[PDB]
Amino acid sequence: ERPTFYRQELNKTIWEVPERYQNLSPVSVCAAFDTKTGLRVAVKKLSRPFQSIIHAKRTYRELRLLKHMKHENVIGLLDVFTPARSLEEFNDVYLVTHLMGADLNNIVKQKLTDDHVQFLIYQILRGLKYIHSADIIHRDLKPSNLAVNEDCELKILDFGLARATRWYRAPEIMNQTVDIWSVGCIMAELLTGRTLFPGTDHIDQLKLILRLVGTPGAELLKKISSESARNYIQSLTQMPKMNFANVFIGANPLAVDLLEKMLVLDSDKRITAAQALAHAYFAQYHDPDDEPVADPYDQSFESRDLLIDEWKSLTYDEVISFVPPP
Template sequence: MVYRRWEGMFKNGINLILTLYFFLSLSLQHLNLISMSVSSSAVDFRTGTKVAIKKLHRPFQSELFAKRAYRELRLLKHMKHENVIGLVYVFTADLSLDRFHDFYLVMPFMGTDLGKLMKLQNLSEDKVQFLVYQMLKGLKDLKPGNLAVNQECELKILDFGLARQADSEMTGYVVTRWYRAPEVILSWMHYTQTVDIWSVGCIMVEMLSGKPLFKGNDHLDQLTEIMKITGTPTQDFITKLQSQDAKNYVKSLPKVQKKDLQELFSKVNPQAVTVIECMLLLDPESRVMAAEALTLPYFSEFREPEEETEAQPYDHSVDNSDLSLEQWKRHTFTEILSFQPQVVESRETAL
């Protein structure tokens, strides 16, 4: 009877035996309570590899949280890039939709994040090159805590811009601001991919210098710190601003000349400074795009163009819907049932 209930639950595509086996094959190592989830590391005995398990904290306590949980699950399912965290497995202990309250995301285990790594050690030139190269390959909304790194210096992006929707509710908000593009800070204009290029530039400077470049105390102070380096906007840039209030504010700022970055970072590899110069431009339309940045001489040692794949288009139609809490739950439950895990043989078995 119990078997039949499980069989009915997974009739939409998840193999029952594999699911039960996966539950039994995880050896939990430790738990860590963080703001939005409970995370643990585990060993998948099918492959012998270490994984991270994330249980979202009360994902259905409100429509906002339910939407965020659904979106995180969808994005993890969608991602198929070696430099972006994807989903190894997803499961729930709840047997039906009316009992559905929690679910668990299983992802690759990385060990640490770039923010912690930078505090522990000064990164060598070749590590900076390799890490920034990987960031550009798998570009998303970036700050050091969103970049997971393992012992082989392999990097994966593990944040999907969720903090853009509700900054005031997220922990680490003050730190996040230091890596935000100026157009995001004051919502000046529509965002393009170059908001993330700005973040890469900020992180790259921090890796090379050992400290954040723009350490503002609030929104306006952040903008002031940025313009000490970039200079105040030109009239051409001001005309692109969508808000008249933003235009008036920028016009009222004291005029500051742009700093010469080659002079400012005179002890840094000039090729690295050239990359930073292309990224930290006030006008987002002038910043280098990821594909173009990858071709710069600074990354030539690590470049493998055939591996620089572009992500498949992501369907945002449901994400952008205005749905009830119960509808978000139903969509999330369906996504869990439809997940098809890729069973990868261990290296020992394959040999």
């Protein structure tokens, strides 16, 4: 059943993919045209998957996450292959998914309207609800990993991997509700057309957040876990909480209300993804019978810290067991 593979040097690196995929353009990920289906697909060649214990762990995980995620707003695994004829020769991993048109970055890079924002944000939260129900958090949600086609059909890209960029990072990590932070941060940029928090360093970044959220309450200040973090909030002046109505001039009262529940430092009281889907701003789009949860994701492998070869062998095994989706 093994097909013929073919080689090419793209941007200083060799791609050994099957015959089925032609015209590879670097979009490292490639925009390849698929001959069997005749569609445009994205092919990802993994960067030194087994050239460290961490790269290897990262490698297995990503494949485990992909062989699992089946949601219309969560990029799915179409194909997984290796030039490898054997486990002993297994050094390269490739993952195949549908190609998208644009990331939410270039979309605004021209400001977005209300129904446009409602449908982009509804979907972002719809995908999380699934990622979240499989006991997974994205941790690095940003415009560059939310992808859409012409039809505004949205996909959550690069979840559960990664661990200028701080822009969308929840302050308690600078629980699942860390991506809700990123959501509200993305929702703001779509409504205005500006980065809400374009901070230059980890100190600046917090000062901007606090300059809008307000300095934490004496209740929240007692709650905080870091001595250095608490002692840094004290070191800073007392900012009040800014009226979002005055910051987001002209928005749907429910959009501004929505962000109030998205930009809250109390990580225990912040809006969850599922909660946000039921909020008044989404009513036209909201469907409780069409907002699914994920089939339990067995992630016991996470508590295990093996050697390169034990991971590689596991990454090899999962490439074998694959049944492509129809």
